[PDB]
Design a protein around this ligand. Structure first.
Ligand code: 9E0
Ligand code: 9E0
Lengths: 321, 321
């Protein structure tokens, strides 16, 4: 069984685009892959953070992953800073990186040193669990290249302990676009809040965002990205939240106009968020949330500890006991 | 009671200069100060190392400190990599350092990133124990300036948890010079091995190095650094290993020439090393050595854990449990 590792930034609420594109897919793929979901709070502080904003966002993310169906027994959901092997292995990989290498990553009061030195910590986050696949996008290519190059450098200079990972998302979800700019991907941090639908938006606000999404005044419910990216995007969201095949959507709405379809979809979005947010409140406001995160941390520590120990033996850190 | 922290590089055997200058003094000052002696193996790998050479040197250093009289109950002798708070607090301080700052430290395959990014780890090594004093020399000034500046930056941006340290050696020992270059300090890494006397030199080899030390052919046993740095240096070693006051040395050897004095001193050096190396073998070849280092690690972990936790709460890492 292949091991998957996904880093999660506690820096914002995922949108419904992120749910359809990734989270919903993770809820399936956790049965067929050994999955790690790591809330990378030590990466979040490479940037300036309010300390209450950061600690709250970390709980929020954990509650959202659990609300989506990420299962603490099937997968390992934990907080990066609670597992010390991450900064231990990150320091070891830092000593074999080069300054030139780290600088080129930054390209693809002063400048915080975290922004230069975080890539080896990302490498560590991955290889500590013998990861085979990382579900990232084009923007993370140079990071994985550095990771694989460091695994090569380590195994070559000391001895084979580390595994090279690949970029692979096992079941890619649909691509969800901004509601009022259908050529751009939906983003949690848009200045036009009508562009996205946050997982924590009020369900009635989200229904309004479906109605205000930029489309023709009317048309047929047909999937055509090149010529009608607006309605096509909406059909993608419909498909994403109901699992109805797209061709099966077209047939349900044959002879229907936009008003009927946007009305049904806004209701579908509202219904989804009401069910999602009840689960989310229930995890977020519960004592069991700390129990779950405790157990996740213990799972990850058991695996990552063995790896750190092999690494320390390979470089000659510590003692032979 | 003031807390003292001394980093120890596992990169070479201390010389008798290092014993007279520092180690012997630490054996006294550990009664009057809360002392931490930390074998910084995570700093040693910033440079290229053979992994067996490094792990052996680490045991050797611990055995030498114990052989000198460093007392595992009075002081805390441990190995840096066995206490995870060091790289945890080092990462936190890294995120508030600036690249410019770290670069200027480097001034005062490529260039290993460890050589750029180690100073915040040094800062962490110190402040984790609420250190008041660090017994370092001129070459470490910019490192302590960075440390104090990071303590200021941390306490100012989040809230007061960290203590500013000072450079202070509570009882400075004598200065011991190279035996065949009396104007340079004695160094463990000289290309002229007659220049130093290693604590692990064969006692008969060391006696020969006393005889081969570069002096006038004869003279009076008088302390005069400007005009007779050779014999004066030797008198310093004599004073350092026997605790005889220097004026009291001059009076013992009034009416004596160099041959008598160098003969007595070579015997004194031989006698000291025989007693030292028996203790050293006895710790180095013992199962109790791992027990001692275990207990040291547990002592340091208890203090440094509380500090790391205050730091994580201050930046908003982790969870409030
Ligand atoms: C969250 C970040 C991160 C830190 N460690 C990891 C490990 C795997 C994937 C990612 C990460 S994804 C990456 C990003 O920049 O999105
Ligand atoms: C061993 C080095 C080191 C790492 N952490 C610390 C903490 C205090 C003093 C020192 C150190 S002394 C320094 C040196 O360069 O000698």
């Amino acid at each position: 069984m292949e091991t998957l590792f996904s880093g999660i930034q506690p820096s914002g609420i995922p949108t419904i685009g992120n749910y359809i594109g990734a989270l919903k897919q993770f809820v399936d793929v956790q049965n067929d892959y050994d999955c790690y979901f790591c809330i990378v709070d030590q990466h979040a502080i490479t940037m300036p953070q309010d300390r209450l904003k950061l600690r709250k966002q970390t709980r929020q993310l954990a509650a959202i992953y659990l609300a989506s169906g990420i299962d603490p027994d099937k997968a390992t959901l934990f907080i990066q800073s609670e597992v010390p092997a991450h900064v231990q292995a990150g320091w070891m990989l830092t000593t074999i990186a080069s300054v030139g290498e780290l600088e080129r990553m930054t390209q693809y009061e002063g400048i915080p040193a975290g922004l230069l030195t975080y890539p080896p910590l990302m490498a560590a986050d991955i290889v500590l669990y013998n990861t085979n696949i990382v579900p990232v996008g084009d923007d993370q290519k140079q990071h994985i290249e550095l990771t694989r190059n460091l695994v090569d450098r380590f195994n070559s200079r000391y001895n084979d302990v580390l595994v090279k990972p690949e970029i692979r998302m096992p079941k890619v979800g649909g691509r969800v676009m901004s509601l009022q700019d259908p050529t751009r991907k939906m983003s949690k941090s848009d200045d036009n809040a009508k562009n996205f639908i946050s997982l924590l938006d009020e369900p009635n606000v989200a229904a309004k965002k479906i109605k205000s999404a930029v489309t023709d005044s009317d048309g047929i419910i047909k999937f055509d990205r090149d010529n009608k990216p607006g309605i096509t995007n909406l059909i993608s969201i419909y498909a994403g939240l109901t699992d109805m095949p797209i061709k099966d959507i077209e047939a349900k709405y044959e002879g229907e106009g936009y008003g009927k379809f946007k009305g049904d979809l806004a209701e579908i979005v509202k219904a989804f968020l009401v069910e999602f947010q009840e689960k989310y409140e229930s995890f977020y406001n519960s004592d069991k949330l700390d129990d779950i995160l405790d157990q996740g941390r213990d799972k990850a520590h058991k695996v990552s500890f063995k790896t750190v120990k092999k690494m320390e033996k390979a470089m000659g850190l510590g003692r032979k006991r």
